[PDB]
């Protein structure tokens, strides 16, 4: 019964035009195997697009837009059809004019369109949707705010390329309020949108900080739902890729104790992101490395370095290694790391199959040795305590083998460690290793 419907939708009688649009909208709503393909191939999209113009009944506009939305929320190719019919600008102008039911349809449509790819995202923005979308967050209608937030986050999503910052940054003031919503889905989507916005240059991080977002985000790290934790954690982590002052705002908002909580999350990936986040704080200045230690984060970090999944261990190793940087100007830090038992896990990690981490791990071990060496030379002792700890943990053997690694920098640092801190007993090797090695 479809070629009939296609003709009833062409009738100049406004009465039949509606009846037809309504029948389309209904089959297009079937839960199981919607007939989106068949309806598209009957050529009726452009006809439905016309039914959304200003010069049309409020009741017809609704049904046409609802039908099209059902199409645009299908496959990437069925969304493409709706976009190629120039439906976006009419969806957009319906956000101003239309009633609330109509607004909710168009906002959902534009969300599905904006979420298909970075091109469609830019396209929605170029068609000046930002202005009307923001205007929706007055409605005090929970389901509409929920939807508008979902769409909003899709306009911010994507790093390569980033969206036009001068446009998407206009949403910061609204989001700043949205992360106070009591509707979980809203809250979640608002946090995603912030995680995307904060994921960029120092100018973007600063925008996030200047609307006072970071205070609230830190509070949200202890929300009961991991659906909130995740994006919130991520936004906070992105802020701390920034400079020392930026990082300091998040520490000042209470992020270290919240990170403590997350280092014992049931989800492995929350723990991984938490480690990453802490590692970017121990990459910070000496006060901040001390703040990390004062928040009792080292002990769980060390525990994860020994028993966590590999991806989590690498991130934890960064956190502990970055922290030993500050050990050359504050030797208390290294002493505390050592005493917390981080030597054996760092050593055991040298055999991981990742040269990026082996390097970081050797840098951490060198810093521990340099502090152990300056410790014994400062008080006329004849032994490097830290060197003996590394030796007794089978770390000497492991560092020794790193000289048989293909990366020249790894070999060179390992060679240096064996010569400097293990002098009489373990030879360093020079370059007859012309049959190279690694992978």
């Amino acid at each position: 019964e479809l070629p009939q419907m296609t003709q009833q939708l062409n009738s100049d009688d406004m009465q039949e035009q509606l009846s037809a649009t309504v029948k389309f909208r209904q089959i297009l709503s079937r839960e199981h195997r919607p007939p989106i393909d068949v309806v598209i191939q009957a050529g009726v999209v452009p006809r439905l697009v016309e039914f959304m113009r200003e010069n049309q009944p409020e009741m017809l506009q609704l049904e046409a837009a609802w039908a099209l939305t059902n199409i645009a929320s299908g496959t990437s190719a069925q969304t493409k059809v709706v976009v190629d019919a120039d439906a976006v600008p009419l969806f957009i102008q319906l956000l101003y004019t239309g009633s609330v039911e109509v607004k909710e349809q168009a906002i959902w449509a534009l969300g599905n369109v904006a979420g298909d790819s970075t091109d469609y995202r830019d396209y929605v923005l170029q068609c000046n949707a930002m202005e009307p979308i923001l205007g929706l967050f007055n409605s005090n209608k929970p389901s509409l705010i929920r939807t508008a937030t979902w769409t909003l986050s899709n306009l911010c999503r994507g790093k390569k390329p980033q969206p036009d910052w001068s446009v998407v940054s206009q949403a910061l003031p609204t989001l700043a309020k949205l992360i106070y919503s009591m509707d979980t889905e809203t809250l979640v989507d608002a946090c995603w949108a912030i995680s995307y916005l904060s994921d960029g240059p120092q100018e973007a991080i600063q925008a996030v900080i200047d609307v006072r977002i970071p205070k609230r985000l830190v509070e949200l790290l202890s929300h009961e739902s991991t659906l909130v934790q995740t994006p919130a954690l991520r936004a906070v982590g992105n802020i701390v890729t920034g400079n020392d002052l930026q990082t300091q705002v998040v520490i000042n908002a209470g992020v270290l104790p919240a990170l403590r909580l997350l280092l014992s999350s049931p989800k492995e990936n929350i723990k991984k992101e938490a480690c990453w986040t802490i590692s970017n704080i121990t990459a910070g200045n000496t006060e901040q490395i001390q703040a990390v230690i004062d928040a009792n984060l080292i002990p769980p970090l060390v525990k994860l370095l020994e028993v966590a999944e590999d991806k989590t261990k690498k991130e934890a190793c960064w956190a502990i290694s970055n922290a030993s940087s500050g050990g050359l100007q504050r030797p208390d830090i290294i002493r505390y790391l050592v005493s917390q038992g981080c030597i054996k896990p760092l050593c055991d990690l040298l055999e991981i199959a990742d040269n990026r981490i082996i390097e970081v791990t050797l840098d951490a071990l060198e810093n521990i040795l340099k502090m152990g060496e300056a410790d014994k030379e400062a008080r006329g002792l004849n032994i490097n305590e830290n060197a003996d700890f590394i030796e007794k943990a089978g770390g000497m053997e492991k560092i020794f083998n790193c000289q048989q690694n293909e990366n020249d920098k790894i070999y060179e640092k390992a060679y240096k460690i064996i010569e400097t801190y293990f002098g009489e007993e373990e030879d360093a090797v020079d370059e007859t290793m012309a049959p190279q090695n690694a992978g």
């Binding site: 979420g115 995603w192 994006p231 890729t241 989800k267 704080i281 990459a283």
Partner: peptide, 16 residues
């Protein structure tokens, strides 16, 4: 301070 994440991802639709 030091390191971007491996991928922005942590996107709502793709993550875990």
């Amino acid at each position: 301070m030091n390191r971007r994440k491996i991928a922005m991802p942590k996107r709502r639709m793709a993550f875990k």
